[PDB]
Scaffold this active site. Structure first.
Site, short mmCIF file in Angstrom:
data_model
loop_
_atom_site.label_atom_id
_atom_site.label_comp_id
_atom_site.label_asym_id
_atom_site.label_seq_id
_atom_site.Cartn_x
_atom_site.Cartn_y
_atom_site.Cartn_z
N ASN A 44 135.25 9.51 -70.15
CA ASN A 44 135.56 9.62 -68.72
C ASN A 44 134.43 9.33 -68.06
O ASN A 44 133.29 9.94 -68.40
CB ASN A 44 136.32 10.95 -68.61
CG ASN A 44 136.77 11.25 -67.26
OD1 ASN A 44 136.69 12.48 -66.47
ND2 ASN A 44 137.25 10.20 -66.43
N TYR A 77 136.80 8.54 -52.75
CA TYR A 77 136.39 9.74 -53.77
C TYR A 77 135.45 10.56 -53.16
O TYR A 77 134.45 10.24 -52.89
CB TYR A 77 136.20 9.13 -55.06
CG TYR A 77 135.78 10.27 -56.10
CD1 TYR A 77 136.70 11.29 -56.87
CD2 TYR A 77 134.45 10.31 -56.36
CE1 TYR A 77 136.17 12.02 -57.88
CE2 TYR A 77 133.91 11.28 -57.36
CZ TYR A 77 134.94 12.27 -57.96
OH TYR A 77 134.41 13.22 -58.91
N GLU A 86 137.73 18.38 -55.26
CA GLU A 86 137.58 16.92 -55.44
C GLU A 86 138.85 16.17 -54.89
O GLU A 86 139.92 16.44 -55.05
CB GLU A 86 137.56 16.87 -57.02
CG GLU A 86 137.28 15.44 -57.75
CD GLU A 86 137.21 15.37 -59.16
OE1 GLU A 86 138.18 15.85 -59.73
OE2 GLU A 86 136.40 14.83 -59.48
N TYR A 88 140.81 12.43 -53.72
CA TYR A 88 141.07 10.93 -53.96
C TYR A 88 141.82 10.51 -53.00
O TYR A 88 142.89 10.98 -52.78
CB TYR A 88 141.74 10.79 -55.36
CG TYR A 88 140.82 11.23 -56.64
CD1 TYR A 88 140.55 12.48 -57.03
CD2 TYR A 88 140.37 10.32 -57.37
CE1 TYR A 88 139.97 13.00 -58.18
CE2 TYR A 88 140.02 10.48 -58.63
CZ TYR A 88 139.72 11.81 -59.04
OH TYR A 88 139.14 12.14 -60.21
N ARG A 122 141.95 21.92 -61.47
CA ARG A 122 141.03 21.53 -62.75
C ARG A 122 140.41 22.88 -63.22
O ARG A 122 140.19 23.45 -62.25
CB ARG A 122 140.11 20.49 -62.51
CG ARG A 122 140.59 19.28 -62.16
CD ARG A 122 140.55 18.43 -63.70
NE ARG A 122 139.43 17.95 -64.09
CZ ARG A 122 139.26 17.54 -65.33
NH1 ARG A 122 140.00 17.62 -66.11
NH2 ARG A 122 138.26 16.81 -65.56
N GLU A 177 136.92 4.98 -61.52
CA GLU A 177 136.89 5.89 -62.87
C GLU A 177 137.73 5.15 -63.84
O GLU A 177 138.62 4.66 -63.77
CB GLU A 177 137.42 7.33 -62.35
CG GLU A 177 137.95 8.31 -63.04
CD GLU A 177 138.20 9.62 -62.76
OE1 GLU A 177 138.07 9.71 -61.46
OE2 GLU A 177 138.42 10.40 -63.40
#
Ligand code: ZN
Ligand code: ZN
Ligand code: ZN
Ligand code: ZN
Ligand code: ZN
Length: 190
Positions: A44, A77, A86, A88, A122, A177
């Site tokens: 990642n 982002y 975070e 997007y 997350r 990403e």
């Protein structure tokens, strides 16, 4: 230049390049707002250019080539703090829609397409403040593209309507990403 993970300013643009330590990724800063990424059997990673700090009303222009082979996103982002989020605004993606399994909260029409809105979480993952638990906000464009303009205010306002609050903006970039895949991209931001 090709660089190892880190952040800073390059030719008038903030950049951020992060990876999970897995090899298979080469990120390169180019002239002005340009950057390129080439990856093969990556882990990642997230890399791109923009601003630090970001704002809540910027119209971001992006263009170039985006050729993912597998799981990858091309997004506006960034992060906020207080709360730590975070976010997007996904303009294009590869084999995996990032909202898979997520509960849809809403939709917003902006810059020629409808976008579907979602919130995910997350738990104890990498972040701008180190390992942390945080929510993620997503607008996912229905009509994929690799150039255009994103009026961030339309998204942030729509998110706010869903109770998706943004705190003080940290960085805000156009990022490529990748998630254990391969591909190439050369993107220019302004
Ligand atoms: Zn496709
Ligand atoms: Zn597509
Ligand atoms: Zn397409
Ligand atoms: Zn398609
Ligand atoms: Zn297609």
């Amino acid at each position: 230049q090709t660089i190892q993970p880190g952040t800073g300013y390059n030719n008038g643009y903030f950049y951020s390049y992060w990876n999970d330590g897995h090899g298979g990724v080469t990120y390169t800063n180019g002239p002005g707002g340009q950057f390129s990424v080439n990856w093969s059997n990556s882990g990642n990673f997230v890399g791109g250019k923009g601003w630090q700090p970001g704002t809540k009303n910027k119209v971001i222009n992006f263009s170039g080539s985006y050729n993912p082979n597998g799981n990858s996103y091309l997004s506006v982002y960034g992060w906020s703090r207080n709360p730590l989020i975070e976010y997007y605004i996904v303009e294009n993606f590869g084999t995996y829609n990032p909202s898979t399994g997520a509960t849809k909260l809403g939709e917003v029409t902006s810059d020629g397409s409808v976008y579907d809105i979602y919130r995910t979480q997350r738990v104890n993952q990498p972040s701008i403040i180190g390992t942390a638990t945080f929510y993620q906000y997503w607008s996912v464009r229905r009509n994929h593209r690799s150039s255009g303009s994103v009026n961030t205010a339309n998204h942030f306002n729509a998110w706010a309507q869903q109770g998706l609050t943004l705190g003080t903006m940290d960085y805000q970039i156009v990022a490529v990403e990748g998630y254990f895949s391969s591909g190439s991209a050369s993107i220019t931001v302004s």
